[PDB]
């Protein structure tokens, strides 16, 4: 007789609920794709972490958020869900985005999530595919926040991306031009002083220069970021023909994997140590003295094991004049670098970062990059 009961209809109510969770297609958040997502937007039918509920708590005209296991839920409300869902949503509010379009994750910066989000959501860009021609259409002009090479200062400059052309320019008759097959672009809000803050690195004579970027709008630099993605692939399906679309997307931009301070010495190994900023771009290692410099002060290329480039815990018994205790020795062909780490944590993550590099087997693109050096 249990099943007659008041109880057994409370509980049947709350089974309802909490199993929505445990179906395959919402394992995950549908906005960053985090573990066990444990909140709901009952207006938008999707089941999303506690860090993106917060993105939604603040477009309230379009989501209303609350916690699947600690908030009451409305009989149509959990049927809402059931016949909704993160699977649904992707057919729904992902219906069209572009293949090269930037998908974030956890690590990601506030903007980035933040306006995916809003793409998503409000704007309901991907399912009205003419709002993507801002970022789509292979041209691109518009004003940014630009700092000076040297100066500190942010001025505004004229950007053009033109797929035609080939190439970035911006003018202060531009005042450079910049091609695409060498442009990469990061998001660097807390290196650049600014949540909107974009860097974006042009390769000439082997030399990089960094470029900071923002804009007041957020919507506009993440769509200046997407139209240079959208460029990018559009010159690699050029230069790799036969590559799928798959294989390029991973290549369209590259975030670091990993920057912070580390102290080197000299090609003599006996100069003195001195503290540098690094960034890890692919098999680029550059050394900066500030962050926001505008040139690195040198560039090593890390190559394959089977090249001769290795990469080893600790330095020589004869080093002497560093300070930061945890050594890295990277063996190059031409040279054997030291650098010191403040900590070991940073040590452990700096050589695994060297190590992926070095046990990677170079692609053919790779050996003409490395002849440069
Ligand atoms: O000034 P110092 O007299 O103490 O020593 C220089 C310093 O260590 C440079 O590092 P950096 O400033 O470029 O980080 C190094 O260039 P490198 O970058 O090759 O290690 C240069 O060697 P070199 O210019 O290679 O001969 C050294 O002479
Ligand atoms: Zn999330």
Redesign the pocket.
Same mark, same amino acid.
């Given at each position: 007789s249990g099943r007659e009961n008041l109880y057994f209809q409370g509980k049947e109510r709350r089974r309802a609920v909490l199993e929505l969770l445990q179906r395959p297609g919402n394992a995950r958040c549908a906005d960053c794709g985090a573990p066990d997502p444990d909140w709901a937007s009952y207006t938008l039918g999707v089941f999303i972490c506690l860090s993106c509920s917060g993105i939604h708590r603040n477009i309230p005209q379009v989501s209303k958020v609350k916690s699947v296991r600690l908030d009451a839920w409305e009989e149509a409300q959990v049927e809402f869900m059931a016949s909704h869902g993160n699977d649904a949503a992707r057919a729904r509010f992902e219906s069209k985005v572009p293949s090269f379009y930037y998908r974030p994750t956890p690590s990601d910066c506030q903007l980035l999530r933040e306006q995916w989000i809003r793409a998503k959501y409000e704007r309901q860009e991907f399912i009205y595919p003419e709002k993507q021609e801002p970022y789509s259409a292979g041209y691109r002009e518009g004003f940014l926040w630009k700092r000076g090479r040297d100066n500190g200062q942010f001025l505004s400059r004229k950007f053009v991306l033109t797929e035609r052309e080939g190439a970035l320019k911006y003018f202060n008759e531009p005042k450079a031009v910049m091609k695409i097959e060498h442009l990469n672009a990061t998001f660097q809000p807390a290196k650049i002083g600014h949540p909107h803050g974009l860097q974006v690195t042009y390769l000439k004579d082997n030399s990089t220069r960094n470029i900071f970027i923002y804009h007041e709008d957020g919507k506009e630099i993440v769509d200046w970021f997407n139209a240079l993605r959208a460029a990018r692939f559009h010159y690699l399906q050029v230069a790799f023909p036969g590559a799928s679309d798959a294989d390029l997307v991973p290549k369209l931009s590259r975030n670091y994997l990993k920057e912070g301070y580390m102290e !080197?010495?000299?090609?003599k190994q006996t100069?003195?140590f001195?503290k540098?900023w690094f960034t890890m771009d692919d098999r680029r290692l550059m050394?900066f !003295?500030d962050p926001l410099d505008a040139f690195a002060?040198?560039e090593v290329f890390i190559g394959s094991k089977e090249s001769g480039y290795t990469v080893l815990h600790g330095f020589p018994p004869s080093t002497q004049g560093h300070h930061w205790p945890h050594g890295i020795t990277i063996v190059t062909p031409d040279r054997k670098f030291l650098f010191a780490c403040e900590t070991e944590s940073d040590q452990r993550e700096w050589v695994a970062a060297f190590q992926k590099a070095v046990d990677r087997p170079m692609l053919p693109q790779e050996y003409a990059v490395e002849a440069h050096f």
């Open positions: !080197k010495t000299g090609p100069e003195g001195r540098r050394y !003295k002060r040198g």
